[PDB]
Amino acid sequence: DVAETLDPLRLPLQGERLIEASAGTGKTFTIAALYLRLLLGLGGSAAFPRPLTVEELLVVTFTEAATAELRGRIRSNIHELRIACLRETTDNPLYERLLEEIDDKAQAAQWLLLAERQMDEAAVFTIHGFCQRMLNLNAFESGMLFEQQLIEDESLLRYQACADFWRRHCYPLPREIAQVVFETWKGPQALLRDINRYLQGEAPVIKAPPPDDETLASRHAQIVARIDTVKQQWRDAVGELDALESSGIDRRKFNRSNQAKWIDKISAWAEEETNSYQLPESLEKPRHPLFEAIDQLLAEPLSIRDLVITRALAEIRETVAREKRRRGELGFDDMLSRLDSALRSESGEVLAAAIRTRFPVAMIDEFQDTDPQQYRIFRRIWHHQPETALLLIGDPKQAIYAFRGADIFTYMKARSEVHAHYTLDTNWRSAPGMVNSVNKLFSQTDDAFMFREIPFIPVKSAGKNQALRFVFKGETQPAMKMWLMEGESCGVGDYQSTMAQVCAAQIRDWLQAGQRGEALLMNGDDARPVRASDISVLVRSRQEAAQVRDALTLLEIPSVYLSNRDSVFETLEAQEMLWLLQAVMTPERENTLRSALATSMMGLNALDIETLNNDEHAWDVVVEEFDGYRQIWRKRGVMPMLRALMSARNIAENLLATAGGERRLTDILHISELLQEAGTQLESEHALVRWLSQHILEPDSNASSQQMRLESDKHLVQIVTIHKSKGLEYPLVWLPFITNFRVQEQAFYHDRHSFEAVLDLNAAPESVDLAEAERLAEDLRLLYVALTRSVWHCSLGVAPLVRRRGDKKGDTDVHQSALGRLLQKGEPQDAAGLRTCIEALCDDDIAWQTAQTGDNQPWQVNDVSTAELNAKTLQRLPGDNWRVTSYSGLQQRGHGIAQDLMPRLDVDAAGVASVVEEPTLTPHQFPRGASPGTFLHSLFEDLDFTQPVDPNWVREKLELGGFESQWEPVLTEWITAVLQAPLNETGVSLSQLSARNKQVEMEFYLPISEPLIASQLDTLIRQFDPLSAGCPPLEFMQVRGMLKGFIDLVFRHEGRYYLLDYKSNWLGEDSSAYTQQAMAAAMQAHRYDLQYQLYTLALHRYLRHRIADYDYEHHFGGVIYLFLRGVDKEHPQQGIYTTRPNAGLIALMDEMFAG
């Protein structure tokens, strides 16, 4: 017992070691040390068998920021100790004591070099990261999915489950029963608020659970039966108006009758006031008659609660689980839970060993916060195992996360199993005066943390800090100062209004006296004025924080609640912005707009609003303004719009100058950052507006919508919670409400023998007594952390608090609080009895005063400022724009992201279809659009023009394409008709083209230097092409760069090369629309003519390039357009179109590019 003062370098790196890193004892410096030792296998007898790799030293922390810092601190130490190995000389502690243990500085340098470059894979994860990691590796054993989705809901999944339970369980109930339930809970909402704690993590063991089968009906019967029989032993016993004590006035007849009418058709376990007329009491105030059965009724409770509950969480759990499986999702409780089952199951050894190898030695940090599930997994892998080491480090005095499931008991359990104990004796980080005061306080009684297994061993304060002191308006102040309210009695109300006031006063008192250089934090002969950034107010709950923030704010002392969870969505700004987006979204409606302008964010006046209502031209002015913002919104988005708005109305600049404006601004900006995300997830502005409403209505979701703290708060007295403060350090700290306690009423305790979480579904005084114990057992634990946060000094508020409505009978249930229990050494005290106990211990480091309230609204601080700024202004200019167009300088958008998702989509088609279904399928009735158009293009992507059209291949093509098989005849006949179709003249017909003379889907890139002006090109395009005579053209604007383009088909009729572009278009009824006229019409209609000139200009450049010494009119003679539809076996020139570029056009057009 009583741990060995831990000497890192001499710690035996071999199996099971428990390390207690007291308050700020350098737990981190220790871990790193131990990490290095392991890497280089250092030590000696207390060393590890062999050297380990970065990817073998398992370290698990609880926080995410934790593993980051831990991972960071280590890469550094390695980089140093490694460097200090190359120099074989180091002049900085730790390292030197390390090199003395090194035998070959040259090797360690190498070994270390690897550890350095290996860090981006250091086995330092969180409890949760470790789990899903082992799990996902040994999937078979854990029955895990290779693709798990991390669930988020649950908080909802849970309510839904709790309600599914209420519907299938309570709805079918018959009135008599239903009502009973109702009087236990009104709805599913109420049932959850009672069982929510459970349902989460390890189900607690239910002391005295209901018979594994009692139905709601069962119990109900027994109860009603037990009730109704006594309705008899009174219905027929009410002929007795008996006799033989005092005080029961004849107004007992009032008592009497009140049960004769208690005879309803039942429906309510509820019964009333007969405690008197029992018998086991009538004597307390031969013994008496036949109604002592009542003595038996008010003996063992008449409830339905425990049964339902037991059924609820039991069923609710599995309901939620099932739902997760189905969804294929996984939560965190599950993550480390599934891992615990795996190590439990038969196939638990292959898993235990597997892990064990990967991580032969693991360091568990912040262990005082584990849980049965964790510790189990842990020992199931490393407990009693040669060739391995389990370094368990944390501090039981700081285990304050009970509410999330950190079971201090499972720690004490682990404390029992591992016999090797170690403590860190030196408290770096803090002042001697402090450490002395904290040690004194927690040394009062024995077992201050009241748990023989969690002893408190004082700690030596570090020498480098022996100089620390805090002087104020004269001399040095005591490390610890107790402020005591006056009086005998004191309610929770008082001890807050008054303590916050007091606290507030003392803060401005240090601050003001700080600017006057009278408040100094000094390290011997060095000093500095205390600044808001140095004060800190620990608190227990949101309210308490507010309570403080208010008294502070009442003294112009700005502050910031570091533990704030509210979301940006329920800020008055969110609402204002929404009204704005509604104005932007419709400046037409005179109302919503005015409304927008009325928002505090717009900083308008009452006068402004007025005039602006009586001047119609200035109104439209604004309307225009907003109509522009909607434009900015439609085109660039919300963020660009909002910022555009602010810049005009000069919002940011004004707000910042409006007290508390900075907060309001950051929040508005924030909203925008969220309103921006949401934008790129909905295709309509209105959809976003909607998006807002909901979020404003049902918020608090992620931590992504949590409020961003200001970058100035680093100069604001910080008010945080004992919890967020664990690990944090503060020059000066204040504990305004450190006396409160709040007694535990819920009978949830841990059995002191079996160390198990038991849930007595019956308020058994015995078990509640036990729980209430564990309560302050944790309050002390919190108290320890609170005092531990300050460096130079800490002053807390104490008062003769009293909860018991017992008229100040020398009560002061102060002894029921962690701090009171330590001051009044256990025993309760007089109001003044406290005042005397405080004086008892109180010198050099400890000192008290009376709660001296005060007033002086000023934080009497002034300012100065000189804004000599300006923003660089670039002297360059846009000028040219290099892009890569592609006969898209034509086709107006809509194809936005379309030519992106499908580079070869039949972009030339689009639309819907209707009643043109005529009961005889023809190529005109073939489904219109892009999806079907590309299907057609597809067919000819790899067809055997040469041979005949196999119907099965066609049936198969439609079958896969999602079309109806009943299209094969029409289609198989349609294809061929187009194949054996005569192109221009002498022969030429797709079917005559063999593979070797075909090149399908050619992708070209025609560089285009010297801006291509739409007009300049329209001129020559005119002179040579009679088609482009319909001159609307030049519909695009200047473009420098490249020219993409796909050619459906380019073939050669042994003599020349050609350009074929299959074009599935029209819904234009039949044949008559595919005539040499109609075709040449749609041609300009879609300006396809350009496609020609461009495409050919490419084939030109290509052929010229390939065919070494080629000529246009000797190798070209092409250009064929096949409008697939309207093409029959015997109606040539219909459906097909042909053109042959002027050759003189291609000439000028080619050089048009590079001049």
Next chain:
DNA sequence: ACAATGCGAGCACTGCTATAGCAGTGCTCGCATAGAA
């Protein structure tokens, strides 16, 4: 074109029955009601 409970105090008043103490009926009113992969 719209507001939570519940618990005892606290004191006023009303029978009794060995003026006072103990009890009980009642209506009014102040008090205390989380934590953060």
